[model samples]
Target: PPMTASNSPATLSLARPDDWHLHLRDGDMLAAVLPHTARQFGRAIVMPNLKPPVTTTAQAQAYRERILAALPAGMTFEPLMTLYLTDNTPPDEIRRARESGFVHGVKLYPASDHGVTDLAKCAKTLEAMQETGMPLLVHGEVTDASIDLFDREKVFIDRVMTPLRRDFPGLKVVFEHITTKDAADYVRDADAAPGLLGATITAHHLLYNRNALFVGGIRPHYYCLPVLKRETHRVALVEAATSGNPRFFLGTDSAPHARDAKETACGCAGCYTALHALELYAEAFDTAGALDKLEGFASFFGADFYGLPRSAETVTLRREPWELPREIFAGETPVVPLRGGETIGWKLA
Candidate 1:
């Protein structure tokens, strides 16, 4: 055999991937961070939670422009925009969003009792969405003060997810950033119409547990909404991702936060993995001995779930050890990433 063949470092090639959930803040922050995602994904479900939130199709259009404007020259990336569903969001807006040709889904952080609370009010809008096949991407944790922070997601599944889906069985829902074993099992076993139910598992949740928060000190960088769960949950997430289930796919939830904001007395929740999301995911799947499954999880499943065309383009990851920048800038402001200032095992080739 040729030396060249034997000397090659292991590599995995995937159809270009997409981020099913992502946040690209507007203005300086947008310009600074858009490139990181553009470099890795063919497209992304750009989050609607900017300062004012993108509640209208018109605003989504504008935000799309801002994201495009932020892209570095010569790189091609698509922002699959979404609308934030609000209590007052007119039923007609759902139709407009689907007809927009680019708006693929509507995202909601429930406006009432808990996650997707008071669902009765959005009945009309929900009907419009179900009619239009517009998936409802939910931020799945409940905000009730009584529930332990760690138990919110599991609680929401029982209190909200179960009945909400029962009443609107036809609606396509995405349980986003799920952190508990209960959540993974729920999605795996849920009885919604085939392909009607799906979920996005973040690299952070797949790779870490609550101990990461208290390992050395209170590690704010590992802090995220829905927070990290126990080791068993992390194992379950890894199992889910590697299970070859199309309904379960990748969504980095690659939220960015400034160094100062993240390391403060009241550190905001998020992990800045946009810069190296692919690398992190590669590590997760690679460690699970499911490198064979990476292409589907990262590249094919999300596009399949959304009914979008999978990429003809491809990207490669290699077993190259590299250091993650401690902090990256959002134009002028310094932002720390999930594994910022650390070394990772994989790199883009």
Candidate 2:
């Protein structure tokens, strides 16, 4: 029952957590990143953004098999699969995805009139999702070049999220990797059923703001989609995550890209964080002086939202300061981690 020992914050205990939004890319990248994630989480809502994207129950199952097959012996983990909602994904597919028992949700990218370019096109599929109780895991930002990158999420709230929720009042939605005060406020105060709406707040967003991007020259490693926001937004995110609201829970959005891929002139958006995810989350919760809330946010709420069982296992964190390696390989390609080469305040026990 003790989450933290009274030993001057040196030791803290928590339930085994989940990474509700995770990207374990296929092939060698999958092999390299999964071990780290499995060690930290009991389960991960494994992402489906592959080269072609996993868009059907069959594809999701195959990808699930690949993930399970890649695990080294003796480590335990679950990959809750999802299908990508293309412009033409069928309503029947939502039924099939739900029936699989392994496929937990469908993803919608590119926020427009209602979180996608054509809400009317997806109406029947969304209705099927609503009936099946499948969550629409939304990437909540309009990719309009006109909007300032920092204000996209906020602008999206005005243009897309509000209307989408109104149209499908019962559909379960996860505003994935939300990064703004506007998002936090919208999700927190929405007049929806308790389980109908929730969000995943990434550790990177909680720990660093936009300043991390330009600090001491350009820092590509800190960059990510729905790129980090201003400090005021970070402060709002911390407040929401630590507020003991069940709707606000943990999702690392721990996307990994090759080091060379990210270092080039045209870099991709992601941060390799699976290596020390729990450690980074520990530091974020600790900074808010809300370490007590970490377990529920990290371990319980997402399970509750997704209607899955929580892990009975527990993990401990100690006040261990250690420097992170500058780079780790995703197969043959290298990846520079979020706080690589820097000292961090916590380590999992």
Candidate 3:
């Protein structure tokens, strides 16, 4: 596609965006994180990987209620719940997911070894989802111990996802937080004419690759699962997102871990970006000189892929400088945000 308009505008405005994938952990963590997301997005696909995981329709309903209850007064945002898929998940759960407006899809965390017995059970789950039209939000990495950390995603495609897609042609799949060129090309080439395949790109993935984690004495705040890829992969993601390809859209995967948890000997994987997700996204799109296409990627594509209407509300980001707080208190522990303590070019208006 042609680059965004050459003439620059000081202020950029667009329809409100939706986070296709998000992790607002429950209770105190939920309260601390929900408002930041609500302030910016119209809706989000709430992840199901809680402690025990949200595995059933009733569990999803209860979690959705907790999210709604935790929302700050006056601000509006919808939590699109999802069920965690496991070998034991009942086929009836897919039917219930389709019937419940609150439950949007099911999450799949893939295992290694396509020939393994576990693959058969996962396929069974996919069959039920295909029958009910429930989308599969995948954490696109193999849990294989032998594969190199950086090569896991590409290998997963070769051994699992490719076969899974071929076997269940009609199942909707959202490759959540994709971090490689292989993933971008796969989603871009998919038969999205039916809107059954798409991917969600995280803000941190777009801004920093593996270098950020080691740039200054191992920054734990920059660490995340499906960990950052090489710079070449980062470039591809920016192009895919800015190219205005409807198949790729916004998803923060803005998982929040407390200071103590993130700074320990073995830090947990997550980066809290909900506070300035849009602003950071705006920064990347602008850097590409493709600011004009930000609106469609950030707002329209995701809702369309999900068969939901685009949000009517609008949010504006101005070409202004703003500093992010070094850290924010989440219940008893402090959580550091991406680009925290740094001045960024864009700000919500």
TM values, all candidates: 0.95, 0.95, 0.95
The residue-level lDDT of candidate 1 at 256 comes to 86
Which segments of candidate 3 are over 4 A away from where they belong?
Answer: 1-7, 111-117, 191-193
**TM-score preference between candidates 2 and 3, better one:** 2
lDDT of 2 by residue, 301-321 (tens): 999999998889988998788
Q: Each prediction's Cα lDDT score?
A: 0.86, 0.89, 0.87
Over the stretch 204-293, how does candidate 3's per-residue lDDT look in tens digits? Answer: 888888998899588888888999999999999999999988888899999998889988999999999999999999888878889999
Give me the overall lDDT of model 3.
0.87
Ranking by lDDT: 2, 3, 1
**Candidate 2 runs further than 4 Å off:** 1-8, 111-116
As for candidate 2, its clashing pairs are 259-334
What does candidate 1's lDDT look like per residue over 289-321, in tens digits?
A: 888998898888889889988999988997878
Using lDDT as the measure, name the better of candidate 1 and candidate 3: 3
- Which pairs clash in model 3? none
lDDT of 2 at 276: 95
